[PDB]
From Swiss-Prot, chains A, B, C:
Keyword entries, A-Z: ATP-binding, Chaperone, Nucleotide-binding
PANTHER family in the cross-refs: CHAPERONIN
Subunit structure: Forms a Heterooligomeric complex of two stacked eight-membered rings.
Record's protein name: Thermosome subunit alpha
Segments crossing the lipid bilayer: none
InterPro entries associated with the record: Chaperone_TCP-1 (IPR017998), Chaperonin_TCP-1_CS (IPR002194), Cpn60/GroEL/TCP-1 (IPR002423), GroEL-like_apical_dom_sf (IPR027409), GROEL-like_equatorial_sf (IPR027413), TCP-1-like_intermed_sf (IPR027410), TCP-1_chaperonin (IPR053374), thermosome_alpha (IPR054827)
Single GO molecular function: ATP hydrolysis activity
Primary role: Molecular chaperone; binds unfolded polypeptides in vitro, and has a weak ATPase activity.
Alphabetical list of CDD domains matching this protein: cpn60
Length: 518, 518, 518
């Protein structure tokens, strides 16, 4: 009896499970090659012929037009991992896929899904306790470890060629805009700006302790360089003001055509005169600046810039120390900010404004350079991750070794937790534990090593030498990730297991899929 | 650079392996609920609209219009298993599929298919050894075991309602046509005819120590019943014979128009006179019988039948002891066969000839009755299987318990063989051993029993009590198959493992699939 | 100005070279995974749905529907190699592709194709000299090496599971039909029949020192088994013969109807009586057998078979020693052949005739069994190669180590030959030599070993220990092929280089491709 519309597709029970799992697995496989130090990249081309070349899992899954629903749900694991910890986007998706693969073996063994699901929840919760226990507490601002966290982040990416320079820029940037409340640091990444410009190479990238703005000096006669700039920030337009209430001038005598025109000029000259009087020799305005206003500004030798982005005004304030004033009339010397140099400079032929040498900038800019626009964008993506993992360690003074060490550690301990629990749930906990091994595994795989062998050795060596024993892909054998400085924020593992677990459990609970005709 | 025509599709490596294994697995999953005493049936409607209702895996995979290359390969397994042993077609395919499923777990672990293939080959070869060892040597013609074999074969099929009767008919039929040369029996199933007529019920099916031909007595005046029949078998037509070489009569006088007519009449009369003179009272002719010959045959009180199939002539020869004569002229009394009764009877209002009560018939007929055409057709299929297993056991003198017992013994033993082999091969041997457990597992599954627990209890009981321990889908617990009388020919398992394994290995060696545009 | 019709495609110079070379390379990369002991198989499905599963390069390229012209030319390399030496079809193709790839490096360098061509011819000619010198001369009939040859040939193919049995059968078949004229052996492969029936496993395959025919005994009363059979071979139908010249019978009296009828009857009986008179108890007729002749044939207790294939009649003659007679009347006791047993046996339910126990059979049969039809076909193909390499060795008492030893030996030596030639031709000779390394490289690659490292170790070890050093794919290191018994005929390498080089040079001389519209 016709219940559903013609064209509606539907799968139930094993069908639903098999397809959902297979689709999540294929997605995971698709991106496992971006994982690690020998990670490779993808070139994505949308319908508009727009190109994206990247190593970033989240970006990849977000940019690809995915059809299958289970596949789409995997995009959420990467996106969340990304927002929360930066790195580990591939790891989360890869573990999710492997978790579902091991789950199916139990499904085919006729083990009820809720039992599998119960076991996975237990394993996931035990994994968080284990990660907290084995987490290496470090000094929130120890430039040493921070620099290590950064450099690790950048490894395996296009910009790894200059990981030392880039790591330095990121760590420095985070340290500078970091704010300490009471021993605990808090970091707002919005205070770190990334400015991009093709030209030169990635080597020439730099950290400006101030702000770099893609704008020009409004008038030709204004100074193109100011030494110890006294900076005024105004968001209101430097134009003839009109009331909010509707108004119109009623002219009744010829002498008024001039009196009103001179009044509007006077209003405009006073705004500029006021600015000058505060001692400001540099002015950034959010809205526009009329030609007349530009004229007096120049005559005063004051450098001005109009139509500045609200987000830039805010960074300018935080770096220079100036206070954004809404109406010019309220501008006072106390409001002015400072900058060792404010100068218009041409990059790749196009003018820009550098506000550098600020006292104790609370906002900073990393100027990215590179031989190509595509190179430029990927370097930016990598810097975003690097600055985020650095941030993570300053907010949570905890790190972990990489190389698959933590997942190997979890694998070992979860296996014993399974024995304590027993029953069919143990079968689920053990499978969850074995699933964690894809990380160590695909790390080797991507390096071109022998998966079966490497695992045997790493797990063995790990059992003999402890928590820091992971896989050194470059060397092709187990090693102490800690001694080698290959570490990552505790938050990376934690969030990855959380997102991977909850996604897997959700998919596992599905036994009926109903899709309407598109 | 184009190498291949458009419309050509291709899959390499993991893709190829994944698609081939999934197709084979799905085909195996499709036929698995037909397995065992709790097995169910399928209804197949082809393109023309013809309907087939059966439980036979071999018949099912043959009637289905399968597309995928890998699925078509599974058809070969069931088909070969069917020609060789009769029973075990579902079993062979299901093991085939599970074998591939367990293999993919090793493929996903990066174990080289060459290794897996070698290990599987080792387990397969070893399995045949174990089977030959644990096989129960029985008396080739033991009535009791033969009936058990036939009854086990029939149970789980549509005709199980009358398994006792049908098993009886099957065993008796094979015993009657068996040829012992030197202690070794040899059966030609072509000497056992299955005749079907809807009407009555299956309970009315019977064994005729002779033949039943779907033919009528050619002439109305001939006898419809003949007691102690002296049967003649002629294949040449009882009509005016014409030379092989072209010939024509040249009439040159009126007197010849009658002389040639009378000569042809004479020749015809002589054929019949000659037959009558041998003492024959019943005559079976392969070709036609001229109306005049019919007339004279009737005057002699001789019952004749024409256009009898060659296969029917040969069975009549083997049943009655008569000798097929090519030319009437060569017929002598020594060529005549015997029959306690030859008679024309109407089954479902349609006339048929019964040749029964023959001395020591070397060819026999099982007449199948049923309340429907579809029922009779499926009963026929069940009887073909019963006669085949009863046959396997008379040529081989070995049986095995069923209920999953053999596969459980094999799993246990092969698991130990894996250990002495060691290395990666051992991994494959272990997975091959475990694969064999789908039989015991699907038997419980089809019966609605908790697969996980049944399997643990069965393996436990087997290790304690031995070879005969299998699953009893009725008692819903492990039991001694031997004591319950649940046995099957040893050739069933031997062949099943051979076709399943050689098919699995072949599919496992495929890493490239190239299909043209249809 | 239009010269060529629309739809005509054209490529000149580098475009033409690039295209042809890329197509040839891709074809080569397509079959390289089938190379060696770890070689894998392909599944081919044509436009009609027919399925072929092989590892055989010649079969693969022959079944695929290739479009590009250069790719088709590669097919010829494989077919010729297959006809000349059986094994080495992948090697020839893979080397041709590699030769072309290395040559394009010189083309990009602007080295005139004429130079590359000259150099390649020089290297190819020297290669044959080197091969003739390093070839290990052996006893054309030395059983041990012969078995090593056959076994080496079978490894890496689907049937490798039973290489020992199949190697023995192959060697045996070839020895038994080989003909030594004057110390020099000559083998006609037409004397070895490959008969196949699905059922059992490949272990049940065997060698019949006689012939196996897929025919039945014509009459039901004839013997089904003849012990010390005296075999008659007639290729003329046992029927009423007719003149070649047109002829008709003109009947003028009624008594001629029976006289001519009787005359034809006597003609058939005379034929059969004549055959009986020779003492023959088994007769094989190429054409038909009239029913009356069958009747009399059966009365003489003579087993008869009709419609025997011409090629089968010829094998029976060579196996039994019988002489094929055209006209029955010419048959004499001296024409009769012998067989220890001629018997009708059923295989997979189908009747077949076995002619075994023949004196010194000059023709023989290898019966192939197996779990599926696809398995059997692949076994046959593996057997065709095995019997072909065994033949090469008996006809050329020379062999070579495999595992990539000859090609490594050639690379080293040809590299030196380049030095004594010098100049641009020398660049070509060095590239030719370098090209030969894809065999060792692809052997390692198919095993999943590290290609670059294995080449360094193998070449090194080879330089120190000698000719026999090749790659041990299973142990994963260099090894002495000769000691391992891994050898192949000298003809395989020779023909492979000849075809690979003559083909590469031809493609290399093409600077213009003009293809019409199909």
């Amino acid at each position: 009896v016709v219940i559903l519309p013609e064209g509606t597709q539907r799968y139930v029970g094993r069908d639903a499970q098999r397809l959902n799992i297979l689709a999540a697995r294929i997605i995971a496989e698709t991106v496992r090659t971006t994982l690690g130090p020998k990670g490779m990249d993808k070139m994505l081309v949308d319908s508009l012929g727009d190109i994206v070349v990247t190593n970033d899992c989240a970006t990849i899954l977000d940019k690809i037009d995915l059809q299958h629903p289970a596949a789409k749900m995997m995009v959420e694991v990467a996106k969340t991992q990304d927002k929360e910890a930066g790195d580990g986007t591939t790891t989360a998706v890869v573990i999710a896929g492997e978790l579902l693969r091991k789950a199916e073996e139990l499904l085919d063994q006729n083990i009820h899904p809720s039992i599998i699901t119960k076991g996975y929840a237990l394993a996931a919760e035990k994994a968080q306790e284990i990660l907290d226990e084995i987490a290496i507490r470090v000094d929130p601002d120890d430039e040493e470890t921070l620099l290590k966290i950064a450099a690790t982040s950048i490894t395996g990416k296009n910009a790894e060629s200059h990981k030392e320079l880039l790591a330095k820029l990121a760590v420095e940037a985070v340290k500078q805009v970091a704010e300490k409340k009471d021993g605990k640091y808090v970091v707002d990444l919005d205070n770190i700006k990334f400015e991009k410009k093709a030209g030169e190479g990635v080597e020439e990238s730099e950290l400006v302790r101030g702000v770099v703005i893609d704008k020009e000096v409004v008038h030709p006669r204004m100074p193109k360089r100011v030494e110890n700039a006294k900076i005024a920030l105004i968001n209101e337009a430097l134009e003839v003001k009109k009331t909010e209430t509707d108004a119109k001038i009623n002219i009744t005598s010829p002498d008024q055509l001039m009196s009103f025109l001179e009044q509007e000029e006077k209003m405009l000259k006073d705004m500029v005169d006021h600015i000058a009087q505060t001692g400001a020799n540099v002015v950034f305005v959010q809205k526009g600046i009329d030609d007349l206003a530009q004229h007096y500004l120049a005559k005063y030798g004051i450098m001005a810039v109009r139509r500045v982005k609200k987000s830039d005004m805010e960074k300018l304030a935080k770096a220079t120390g100036a206070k954004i004033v809404t109406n010019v009339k309220d501008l006072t010397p106390e409001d002015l900010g400072y900058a060792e140099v404010v100068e218009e400079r041409k990059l790749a032929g196009e003018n820009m404004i550098f506000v550098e040498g600020c006292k104790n900038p609370k906002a900073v800019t990393i100027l990215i350079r590179g031989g190509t626009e595509h190179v430029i964008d990927e370097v930016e993506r990598a810097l975003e991750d690097a600055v985020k993992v650095v941030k993570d360690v300053m907010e949570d003074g905890a790190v972990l070794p990489a190389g698959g060490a933590p997942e190997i550690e979890l694998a070992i301990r979860l296996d014993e937790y399974a024995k304590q629990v027993g029953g069919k749930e143990a079968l689920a906990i053990e499978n969850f534990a074995d699933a964690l091994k894809i990380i160590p595994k695909t790390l080797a795989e991507n390096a071109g090593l022998d998966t079966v062998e490497m695992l045997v050795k790493v797990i063995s060596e790990h059992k003999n030498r402890g928590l820091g024993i992971g896989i050194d892909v470059f060397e092709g054998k187990p090693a102490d990730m800690l001694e080698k400085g290959i570490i990552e924020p505790l938050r990376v593992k934690k969030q990855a297991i959380k997102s991977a677990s909850e996604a897997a459990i959700m998919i596992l609970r599905i036994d009926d899929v109903i899709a309407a005709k598109a």
